[PDB]
Design an enzyme around this catalytic site. Sequence first.
Site, PDB file in Angstrom:
ATOM      1  N   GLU B 106       0.819  -1.192   0.000  1.00 54.99           N
ATOM      2  CA  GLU B 106       0.000   0.000   0.000  1.00 54.99           C
ATOM      3  C   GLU B 106       0.874   1.271   0.000  1.00 54.99           C
ATOM      4  OE1 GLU B 106      -0.149  -2.690   2.172  1.00 54.99           O
ATOM      5  OE2 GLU B 106      -2.159  -3.438   2.135  1.00 54.99           O
ATOM      6  N   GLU B 117      -4.038   7.613 -11.985  1.00 63.21           N
ATOM      7  CA  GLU B 117      -4.963   7.119 -12.999  1.00 63.21           C
ATOM      8  C   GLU B 117      -4.508   5.794 -13.576  1.00 63.21           C
ATOM      9  OE1 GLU B 117      -2.829   9.749 -13.769  1.00 63.21           O
ATOM     10  OE2 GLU B 117      -1.670   8.168 -14.739  1.00 63.21           O
ATOM     11  N   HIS B 159       6.359   9.279 -19.104  1.00 67.17           N
ATOM     12  CA  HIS B 159       6.023   9.719 -17.746  1.00 67.17           C
ATOM     13  C   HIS B 159       6.737   8.939 -16.652  1.00 67.17           C
ATOM     14  CE1 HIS B 159       3.281  12.543 -19.383  1.00 67.17           C
ATOM     15  NE2 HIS B 159       2.554  11.608 -19.965  1.00 67.17           N
ATOM     16  N   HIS B 197       1.778  15.671 -24.060  1.00 64.29           N
ATOM     17  CA  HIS B 197       2.065  15.812 -22.656  1.00 64.29           C
ATOM     18  C   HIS B 197       3.566  15.973 -22.437  1.00 64.29           C
ATOM     19  CE1 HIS B 197      -1.719  13.514 -22.948  1.00 64.29           C
ATOM     20  NE2 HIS B 197      -2.069  14.328 -21.962  1.00 64.29           N
TER      21      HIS B 197
HETATM   22  N1  LIG Z   1      -6.300  12.230 -15.461  1.00 67.29           N
HETATM   23  C1  LIG Z   1      -5.679  12.400 -16.773  1.00 67.29           C
HETATM   24  C2  LIG Z   1      -4.497  11.461 -16.966  1.00 67.29           C
HETATM   25  C3  LIG Z   1      -3.853  11.800 -18.290  1.00 67.29           C
HETATM   26  C4  LIG Z   1      -2.683  10.891 -18.605  1.00 67.29           C
HETATM   27  C5  LIG Z   1      -2.214  11.166 -20.014  1.00 67.29           C
HETATM   28  C6  LIG Z   1      -0.937  10.404 -20.303  1.00 67.29           C
HETATM   29  C7  LIG Z   1      -0.488  10.498 -21.760  1.00 67.29           C
HETATM   30  O1  LIG Z   1      -1.247  10.378 -22.711  1.00 67.29           O
HETATM   31  N2  LIG Z   1       0.772  10.772 -21.914  1.00 67.29           N
HETATM   32  O2  LIG Z   1       1.391  10.884 -23.144  1.00 67.29           O
HETATM   33  K   LIG Z   2       6.010  16.409 -25.130  1.00 69.44           K
HETATM   34 ZN   LIG Z   3       0.503  12.109 -24.282  1.00 71.46          ZN
END
Ligand SMILES: NCCCCCCC(=O)NO
Ligand SMILES: [K+]
Ligand SMILES: [Zn+2]
Lengths: 341, 341
Positions: B106, B117, B159, B197
Amino acid sequence: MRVIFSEDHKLRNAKTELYGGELVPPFEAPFRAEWILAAVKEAGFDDVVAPARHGLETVLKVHDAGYLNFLETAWDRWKAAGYKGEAIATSFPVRRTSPRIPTDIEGQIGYYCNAAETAISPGTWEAALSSMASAIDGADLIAAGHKAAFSLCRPPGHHAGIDMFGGYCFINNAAVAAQRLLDKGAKKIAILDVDFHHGNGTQDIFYERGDVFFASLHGDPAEAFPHFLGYAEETGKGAGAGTTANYPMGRGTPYSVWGEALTDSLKRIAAFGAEAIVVSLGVDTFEQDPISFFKLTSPDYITMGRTIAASGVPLLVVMEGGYGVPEIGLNVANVLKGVAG
Amino acid sequence: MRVIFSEDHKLRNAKTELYGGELVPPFEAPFRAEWILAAVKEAGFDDVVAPARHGLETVLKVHDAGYLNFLETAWDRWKAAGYKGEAIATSFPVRRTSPRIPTDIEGQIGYYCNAAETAISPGTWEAALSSMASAIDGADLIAAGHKAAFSLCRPPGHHAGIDMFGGYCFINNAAVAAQRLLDKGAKKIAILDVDFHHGNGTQDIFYERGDVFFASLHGDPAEAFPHFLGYAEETGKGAGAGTTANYPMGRGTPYSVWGEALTDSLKRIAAFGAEAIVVSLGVDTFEQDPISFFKLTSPDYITMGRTIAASGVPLLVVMEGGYGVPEIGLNVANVLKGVAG
Ligand SMILES: NCCCCCCC(=O)NO
Ligand SMILES: [K+]
Ligand SMILES: [Zn+2]
Ligand SMILES: NCCCCCCC(=O)NO
Ligand SMILES: [K+]
Ligand SMILES: [N+]
Ligand SMILES: [N+]
Ligand SMILES: [Zn+2]
């Protein structure tokens, strides 16, 4: 002793909590207050009064203004953004992130959150204000000379830090009460957090302050929520040096061990010279509590209340956690019996 | 041009994503890879090969060992703990927390996560390793003299930071590819992240390194995921001074504006002296993308590929995001057409 309780707790009636990867009904639900109130009345504590309302004077001295502004509009902004569920953060400013505050609701809810299981729902802010008000009125009773009072707070408070909500908490009721006691003339106050979980929000608020001693007995954060604070090495910084005392304990801890930590915490509080103690009372230390791993029995709560009151300084008892089972009320009432006996 | 793709991406087939306070089918779904593969083949890129498997040698140079160990066992530990949903973090090490690592699942899942998410599901680790392998084999083609290759990575990577997963990402494929190129003899490499992003994971990995230049064009983090990195002021630290370049842009940005940032980023990369460019290609910049706010058109992807390839240095294209519609495939294929033309 007087019991301060607002029916406006019911304005927080969230539909969901993220638990075990599912959205389930929340552990921290209105029936808790119903059960506790009934039990305290059954035990003879029937001097129950609603709090007067309060503005933000006191709370602005323990919570950040941006944070409070955020809570006031969070639900409206979430709904306006078109989302269909309750307001649940998912991105967080974790290691090696920018300190900047986002402008949108999705970014801000994460910025201002430490724990995503807690959804913001319509009525949450109003309920939180009512719970704060119960704590303030309880503090005022102590400031005016009572030696004991009980603020039946819901929602609870102790996971709300300077600028973050989580753990079912939004406004740190116990911190507001301690601040109120200072404002009414005390120079030194202690908060003693006997809820199963570490009061990380409370610790955060006072960590660099020497006017409020913070002691917590709790499940070891290595294996218990809130996971990221509550180690014994955290004793305070700056003006707060030496005025945080954490007592992490392990699985199955019974009163014979827990009570030794209680004794030590009260020694620390007495050496600090607290003029009053705000007790953050959670009864999730109970052997049946569904989310916790201590093994206190119902009679142990009487012992606990008696021992804390034997400090010989005034007590404000502030409700925190304790879930699931009918005995949360009995257990709370038993602490009050120990205090009053 | 060779396309590297593993059918083992389908081992990541999570059932849930926390979006808008609900648990919904994930955007980052296996059918994405199907759509992209079909479109690239339709465009004439039918030299498709599976990657050779790889161990952890390269990836241990960009990700923390404890993090990788955690991912390997996370699902098993979550299931063993009795939870009924997929593995979703909720408590995070945010402001003013202890740096200690919890021992239970946890606490650890939060410790090692930047974004809730993203659920861990059975097969996720295995899928992430296959995706990493596609990136490594693509890098090896460039190292051996190819001027272009496409690694059809799924799950995506950008990410995933040194020690955290999130944003649908677990292993930072682009970072691993860059490292692989260094290990094969390059001294200077750039990663150019054109996904909508911010590549916060990639930035994190190389922020204090001077061997890999990181440039990202993205929605302004003030109003876009990942919310807590990607500001223009972030230019690097220590050995990484001057080798991060962020280009945040606002709602509705079309190619006429986006392409100006592209030109600037390529000027910076050329001045740095990159021997190859790893392109983190998301097509979530598209005007129909369901979670993003830029307005690129399908033809713009051809322009983008051409411009990047006009650097005159070898390119490895690594798949990132882009959702919702089968035109994600056309859009990817169009970048490759621009590169190959
Ligand atoms: N609550 C929204 C989460 C968004 C995550 C997007 C990640 C993504 O597409 N990265 O390229
Ligand atoms: K980018
Ligand atoms: Zn993206
Ligand atoms: N995901 C587990 C969340 C547990 C929150 C417990 C909060 C609590 O009862 N505090 O006193
Ligand atoms: K506690
Ligand atoms: N303190
Ligand atoms: N860098
Ligand atoms: Zn608790």
